[PDB]
Design a binder for this molecule. Structure first.
Ligand SMILES: [Cl-]
Ligand SMILES: [Cl-]
Ligand SMILES: [Cl-]
Ligand SMILES: [Cl-]
Ligand SMILES: [Cl-]
Ligand SMILES: [Cl-]
Ligand SMILES: [Cl-]
Ligand SMILES: [Cl-]
Ligand SMILES: [Cl-]
Ligand SMILES: [Cl-]
Ligand SMILES: [Cl-]
Lengths: 396, 390
């Protein structure tokens, strides 16, 4: 039934909160932590010049093959090969998409049929469950036991993954670094994921969107380079939307399995034809930015990461994993005198802070909220202090 | 089966004589060097990038300010109200709108009425969502140019058989014919009578030739505005395809479903691209008129050349830049003749099988091209038809 299918995809007012609100607002600059601030951390220098050169070049840029401009795919494949530590095939193993979201949609569409079991991590990216269920697959959840003082692994329940595959799951989709928690899977976790997938003949979609924004002294392991895994059963997706602040151009890529990439190409034709022709041109600069630019960017984000962690952990009932790549923090809040959903509204009403409710990522992370901390440094820190002040005001 | 599902989404001995040389022309899509993107569109994109994060990120359904600008423009154009808040979505191209509109209206097993010939995606989308296409013949091969030639009895019978969606392009891609006031009035009356939803793909409806009428389905008194979705955008007429922008408007129920799905298909139309829509339907006085006049001259000359060959038929395009000539019996197959036109004339045309299984002896040209190059290429096409004539 079309109606039920789509039901599953579904100023701040005080209405319904009048008996619950305590005190007056806390003055300060509003911060929307729901996504990155591309004014505080600008799009790659040079990107707009590349876009402008493409427009001037004209119809050759405006129209491309459905899988993406050939010249740009040929430029990108060596860069993406060097980054991930395994071969990339420009011609048949690489598609350019409308955002990494574009790639994710296509990748799930090309791999999940009606009734197929799909292993999905909890917590993980908001679209993952919704995609599986839109294509009438059956999610088999795999717990991420990320709540731990042991920060040498993400905490994936690998026995749970294996059991998912024993039960008939032939697809596994995950983000690395994890959105929302910012944890990165260890070498051993990725090795076992690779071995389990190969063992059961499962396809893996590895969403490495934020994997380039990797903090000093964090390790990162690319599933697609594992000796245990068959390269032709892995699709890796990533792009420049967040690390490089190019979200406004709407670009992503997917690479790996030729059979799956060929399916994603055929589908892209009828989903949106192509990634915007003119947008594609900015990818000529991707992984070829000025020396030290990415390194400074990672350093500026790491300073924000560390001060936000100091402020949040300063609150006695708050737990948060250290993010190891990307710009997400996922603090678990204490018992409050209001429900989690009510507190999110109250943060906006009384602190001018937007945060993402933890229920977007799993039904079992309801008392967490997600922050995207790619923000103005000082505004972000001041906002965080308002959050914890309100956590104290509403503490059960 | 997933393999079977995606399977549906897909000379030397025969050569006569030497090639014919001349400037090559790709008629498979429009030439936006010959017919430039709207003046000022790039300045809008640039000002939007300068404005920064407020433009890079929008609501999934599209920038609100831009939806508010567009709704009265689309209302004046189509002649019926447009609801910017709950009745209008900005998509990645009109293709993007088409995908979401079919997804939002076609469940597994549903009968969907589809025109033959029509746009390449229409059959593929219905089949991707496991709908059952019920075909409706367009009898466009006629000297009568007062109507497109849709089999309205066939449409009614589709609805009698249980079809509750009807999707069609107007002007028709590939033939370029526009549905008459009577044809559109009757599609509205039939849809209302059977409670069917209609998706009106009016992508090329703005490039309307002088002396041609155009009738908007969504303005028909007989039709329920809440069971119509109209899709269009600036990709072809305005040469903005490279920004990847379309809109859908109409039914609040269906548009809501489209917005929810867009969130997981691609999040949004590219935030920076969206800025260029601030100029759409606000181009300088005379600009659209001049563009139509330039295209109409191309149209007329290409028709003169193509019809000069005895065995060629083509309907006069009434809106948009598509011609769809039917070719005589050749000593080679149609598929082979398209390869020969490339190799011996430097001409790319689109095979008629993209649009219907029963128009294999036709080819589609997009004639939004350099005028002189386009006419010289047409002459090469006709020379080779004569050379290969069975
Ligand atoms: Cl290309
Ligand atoms: Cl997100
Ligand atoms: Cl965007
Ligand atoms: Cl195209
Ligand atoms: Cl930075
Ligand atoms: Cl010669
Ligand atoms: Cl908005
Ligand atoms: Cl087309
Ligand atoms: Cl977003
Ligand atoms: Cl023009
Ligand atoms: Cl004949």
């Amino acid at each position: 039934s079309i109606e039920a299918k789509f039901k599953k995809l579904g100023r701040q007012s005080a209405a319904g909160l009048e008996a619950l609100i305590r005190g007056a607002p806390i003055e300060g600059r509003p911060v929307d932590f729901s996504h990155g601030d591309v004014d505080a951390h600008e799009p790659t220098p040079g990107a707009f010049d590349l876009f402008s050169a493409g427009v001037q070049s004209g119809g050759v840029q405006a129209y491309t093959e459905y899988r993406g401009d050939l010249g740009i795919r040929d430029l990108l494949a060596p860069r993406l090969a060097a980054f991930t530590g395994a071969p990339v095939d420009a011609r048949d193993g690489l598609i350019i998409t409308p955002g990494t979201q574009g790639a994710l949609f296509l990748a799930v569409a090309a791999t999940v049929a009606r009734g197929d079991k799909v292993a999905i991590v909890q917590p993980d990216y908001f679209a993952n469950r919704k995609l599986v269920e839109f294509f009438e697959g059956e999610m088999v959840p795999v717990q991420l036991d990320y709540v731990s003082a042991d920060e040498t692994r993400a905490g994936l329940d690998l026995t749970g993954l294996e059991e998912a595959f024993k039960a008939g799951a032939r697809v596994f989709l995950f983000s690395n670094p994890n959105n929302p928690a910012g944890v990165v899977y260890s070498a051993e976790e990725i090795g076992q994921i690779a071995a389990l997938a190969a063992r059961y003949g499962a396809t893996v979609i590895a969403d490495q969107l934020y994997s380039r924004l990797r903090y000093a002294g964090a390790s990162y392991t690319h599933l697609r380079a594992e000796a245990a895994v068959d390269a032709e059963n892995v699709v890796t997706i990533m792009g420049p939307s967040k690390t490089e602040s190019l979200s406004g151009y709407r670009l992503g890529v997917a690479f790996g399995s030729r059979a799956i990439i060929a399916r994603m190409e055929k589908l892209q034709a009828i989903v949106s034809l192509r990634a915007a022709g003119y947008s594609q041109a900015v990818l000529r600069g991707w992984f070829d930015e000025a020396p030290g630019w990415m390194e400074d960017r990672i350093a500026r984000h790491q300073a924000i990461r560390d001060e936000l962690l100091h402020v949040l952990r300063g609150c006695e009932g708050v737990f948060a994993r250290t993010p190891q790549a990307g710009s997400y923090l996922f603090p678990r809040l204490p018992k409050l005198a209001v429900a989690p959903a009510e507190f999110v509204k109250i943060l906006r009403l009384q602190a001018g802070v937007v945060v993402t409710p933890g229920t977007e990522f799993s039904p079992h992370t309801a008392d967490s909220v997600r922050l995207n901390f790619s923000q103005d440094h000082e505004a972000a820190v001041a906002a965080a202090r308002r959050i914890v002040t309100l956590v104290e005001r509403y503490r059960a």
